[PDB]
């Protein structure tokens, strides 16, 4: 329990679970909505994957 | 030359790949025509057969689709060499009999194939419960001990894949197994079939290692030669065959020097430490859901590889 | 069946990478998953072959065989369309590999980790601050020649001749390939399995054929024999003293032919492509996954 001749500065970090609030002005961003088409991926032997 | 236009009209349309649907509750005829895959079993009327379209050449079409029709190899075995309480989805193994004109083959499920190994030296409780006498199975192979003793047992058994239908005959049982293709049952309610392998005989090789995930993780069988009687283990992996031989050598690294320490290899044929064979592929995501298997008395833990695609290969020796 | 995978870029793309990537159309690329849309991470071998100085070719082979394969045809800003490769389907594969390998008629293609330098098949995507490398595809005889040249460099590391091993030769052109010094314990594990097979070969190798080849070099001379320089090896002197017997020769061959199938199948690392009908005027071929 005897001090050495050299000190230290213990750095560390802390994770904090915050609740953010998102605000934006009206008509900020124009976008285009596509056509929601379906597709057929894979024919596994008893089950197909769309 | 206008009839060629009608011929190219009858030949053009592929299966529908894209479909710009609008809403879900409407259920348009076009999305139904995309999702309607034709059946295989229907009632017996010529209009019903015509709507079912089973008369179409090769693949089914109402007067190619990335789907394969399954083949169904047929076998004949004696009634005592098999238990009718076997599961539907279980892989099978043919042993080639030594008679030149045979007719009646000899098929071993891994539960039955266990008692060809234990007699001569849980899971073994059920294997002795179902097939009660080993003597009714010790004779289908004529010379088992000599064939283990020179280590040419693996090139005599070719895997035939999973079982489908067992018409429980009286004396000469006829079973149907899928050697190749989409494993699906021939029932009038066409129910799904899941290939089962008993849990203690089946060690995962993925979580045995404890980012690239493909869709088709294969299932490997492996017969291994032990001085404590040979063993049939099964393997699930998402690797190539090049990877499967190296990681199986690293997995069997205790057993090889175990056999080396107990039995010195006096001749030149004992050095073969068993072999492997791809039994086929399945879905890598929904794989190997556990389940339970009851006989009248007991219950062994058992895995269920669901919606399996059978594809047998030859034997590649482990060393 | 619909096999289209679109990969979304997380940022924009500068015009030089656009011009470079539109040259790289039709090449084989690997993917992380097999799902609908993916991001730029997980594409290419650059995640396992990083921007470093020591490669690892066999782990690159493992990453190639483990993951799926695709082909890149349509590339634009923020988005580029890929087409997957699944067993059961046929495809067209174009020959846009800048070490210009002339393809044999109806042979078999093989994918390959980039042996001809990292900078040769690489697009630097600094906009998404990552790198996409392009895996080489070249025919199977040149594939086995490169692979056995790699392993012979790995085993002759500890001995010394260098230019006669680390440079391939073809009818089209001879090329140089990048050589590391250690491939780590996975390359040592490949050498482990190779030496395992080899030592059990020289346990079980037949002795009728040595008694043939002694009198055959002393009788005949061939291109299959002039590598001995008309000198019998010493183990031919200290092995052919024994008599010649048929039964143990058959029992030796009955395990030798079993083991050599495994020794071939151990060199099956990397996905193989048995293609058909290559045309020297379209620079593409009808291929499918074996």
From Swiss-Prot, chain A:
It comes from the Viruses. Coiled coil: none annotated. It is found in: Virion; Host nucleus. Belongs to the herpesviridae major capsid protein family. Self-assembles to form an icosahedral capsid with a T=16 symmetry, about 200 nm in diameter, and consisting of 150 hexons and 12 pentons (total of 162 capsomers). Hexons form the edges and faces of the capsid and are each composed of six MCP molecules. In contrast, one penton is found at each of the 12 vertices. Eleven of the pentons are MCP pentamers, while the last vertex is occupied by the portal complex. Homomultimer. Makes the hexons and eleven out of twelve pentons. Interacts with triplex proteins 1/TRX1 and 2/TRX2; adjacent capsomers are linked together in groups of three by triplexes, heterotrimeric complexes composed of one molecule of TRX1 and two molecules of TRX2. Interacts with scaffold protein; this interaction allows efficient MCP transport to the host nucleus. Interacts with capsid vertex component 2/CVC2. Interacts with the small capsomere-interacting protein/SCP. This is Major capsid protein.
UniProtKB/Swiss-Prot annotation, chain B:
Keywords: Capsid protein, Host nucleus, Virion. It comes from the Viruses. InterPro entries: Herpes_1 (IPR004999). It is found in: Virion; Host nucleus. One of its GO terms (cellular component) is host cell nucleus. Its main location: virion. GO terms for biological process: viral capsid assembly. One of its GO terms (molecular function) is DNA binding. Pfam families: Herpes_VP19C (PF03327). Interacts with TRX2, MCP and capsid vertex component 2/CVC2. Structural component of the T=16 icosahedral capsid. The capsid is composed of pentamers and hexamers of major capsid protein/MCP, which are linked together by heterotrimers called triplexes. These triplexes are formed by a single molecule of triplex protein 1/TRX1 and two copies of triplex protein 2/TRX2. Additionally, TRX1 is required for efficient transport of TRX2 to the nucleus, which is the site of capsid assembly. HAMAP family: HSV_TRX1 (MF_04018). Belongs to the herpesviridae TRX1 protein family. This is Triplex capsid protein 1. It comes from Epstein-Barr virus (strain B95-8).
UniProtKB/Swiss-Prot annotation, chain C:
It is found in: Virion; Host nucleus. It comes from the Viruses. Structural component of the T=16 icosahedral capsid. The capsid is composed of pentamers and hexamers of major capsid protein/MCP, which are linked together by heterotrimers called triplexes. These triplexes are formed by a single molecule of triplex protein 1/TRX1 and two copies of triplex protein 2/TRX2. Additionally, TRX1 is required for efficient transport of TRX2 to the nucleus, which is the site of capsid assembly. Interacts with TRX1 and major capisd protein/MCP. It comes from Epstein-Barr virus (strain B95-8). Disulfide bonds: none annotated. This is Triplex capsid protein 2. GO terms for molecular function: structural molecule activity.
